[PDB]
Amino acid sequence: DVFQNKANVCWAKALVPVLKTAGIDMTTEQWNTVDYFETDKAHSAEIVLNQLCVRFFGLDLDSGLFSAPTVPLSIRNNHWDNSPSPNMYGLNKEVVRQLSRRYPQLPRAVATGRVYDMNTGTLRNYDPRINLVPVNRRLPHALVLHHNEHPQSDFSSFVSKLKGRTVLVVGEKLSVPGKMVDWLSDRPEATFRARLDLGIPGDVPKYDIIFVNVRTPYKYHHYQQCEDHAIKLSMLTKKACLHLNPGGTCVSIGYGYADRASESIIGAIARQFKFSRVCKPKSSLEETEVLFVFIGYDRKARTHNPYKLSSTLTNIYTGS
């Protein structure tokens, strides 16, 4: 039983038959290379599928590699399962055929659940470091050249300088001088105590400022860190838009949008605000770290130009 001692990995479950269409059989050890499996947290089966697709085959879901409507990934009662729905996935053999000209051993990889090393064209056993980026994806901004191990960033000063009276801090505790601060976290001392992997609870009230004080560990690459953070942007940063007063502000720790989900999520958040920017205060030490800044929450219809935030991210990360 690969899911022994796990209570919150329905998503990994649901993925078994999807992954099986590409010959993949994940062991417990291999499942532990997914952060949320190891820490036993609620996750999106779809984001995880994209992660595994890249690691195994060096390609993300926009390649169409899993676009065959074979197995459903569905949500019922906030539980992932394979119950019938119009949200289906599976190895697409036509797509495999198209890709085989450029990637001769890819059909064998997807037949036998082996890693297609985009670097060598040769087959490997599973290792999350072999394919660090999807080769099919045009990255919307540059990624950092070097990552180092710094202490955590102290954002107290930054937040205290924002306009607004009422603050909700989500995640790690933060003192904010001169403002009222509610605290949402899974700790006994929190104003609102809840499991943050289940998102901002519906019964949390509205605020002037929401600061998502949540980090994601760097393991292999900026890409990995970014895609592991994506679910938190969905569950916290995006849900935070429902907990803002008119004209309110949401600020969130992030790592850009290297992956397709982060990009989509950020775009959908950005459209609900009059202003959206990215910055990296002097207090932000970890090289991949940035703050997404969303100012002036409204319900107005509005297009978003992703080139604005992408330009800024490229500048921050390349020192340009």
Q: DSSP letter at 170?
A: E
Among candidate residues 102, 136, 170, the one where a domain is terminated: 136
Residue type, 100: S
Q: Where are the alpha helices (DSSP H) in the chain?
A: 10-20, 28-31, 35-38, 45-57, 93-100, 106-112, 156-160, 222-232, 260-270, 306-318
CB 183 within 8 A of CB 192: yes
CB 167 within 8 A of CB 251: no
Q: Are residues 235 and 166 in the same domain?
A: yes
Q: Examine the domain organization and report whether 49 and 170 are in the same domain.
A: no
Q: Residue 16: which of 47, 40, 49 has the closest Cα?
A: 49
- The approach used to solve this structure was X-ray
- How far is 219 from 240, CA to CA, in rounded Å? 27
Residue 56: give the domain boundaries. 1-136
Domain count, the chain: 2
119 and 141 within one domain: no
Taking each helix axis from N to C terminus, what angle separates 45-57 and 222-232, rounded to the nearest 10 degrees?
Answer: 170
Give the integer Cα–Cα distance in Å for 71 and 85.
9
> Which residue type occupies 209?
I
- Asked whether residue 282 falls in the same domain as residue 165, the answer is yes
Half-sphere exposure of 117 (CA within 13 A, CB side): 11
Active site residues: 10, 79
In this structure, are 108 and 234 located in the same domain? no
Question: How far is it, in rounded angstroms, from Cα 254 to Cα 237?
Answer: 10
- Distance, in Å, from the CA atom of 58 to the CA atom of 116, rounded to the nearest integer, reads 7
Tokens representing 5 are 């001692």
* Cα–Cα distance for residue pair 31/219, rounded to 1 Å: 15
Breaks following residues of the chain (C-to-N distance > 2.5 Å): none
CATH number (domain holding residue 265): 3.40.50.150
Q: How many CB atoms lie within 10 A of CB 17?
A: 15
The contacts of residue 282 (CB under 8 Å, 6+ apart) are none
- Residue 87 is part of a domain; what is its CATH number? 3.90.70.110
- Say how far apart CA 36 and CA 8 lie, in whole Å: 9
Of residues 238, 232, 287, 229, the one with CA closest to residue 259: 229
Q: Are residues 146 and 273 in the same domain?
A: yes
- Residues 296, 171 share a domain: yes
- Do both 85 and 101 map to the same domain? yes
Q: What angle do CA 7, 229, 306 make, to 5 degrees?
A: 145
Q: CA geometry: angle at 266 spanning 254 and 260, to 5°?
A: 90
Looking at the structure, tell me whether residues 1 and 107 fall in a common domain: yes
Closest by Cα among 189, 171, 191 to 181: 191
Q: Is the dihedral of CA 41, 55, 230, 142 positive or negative?
A: positive
219 and 304, same domain (yes or no): yes
> Domain boundary residue among 136, 158, 185?
136
In order of 12, 60, 132, 158, the CA distances from 9 in angstroms are: 5, 22, 24, 36
Which of 136, 153, 173 delimits the end of a domain? 136
Give bridge partners of residue 180 from the DSSP assignment.
166
Tokens of 45: 């089966």
Query: Do 18 and 65 share a domain, yes or no?
Result: yes
H or E, element range at 207:
strand 207-213
Residues 171 and 252 in one domain: yes
The angstrom resolution of this structure is 2.2
Strand, helix or coil for residue 281: coil
Contact, 15 vs 3, CB < 8 A?
Answer: no
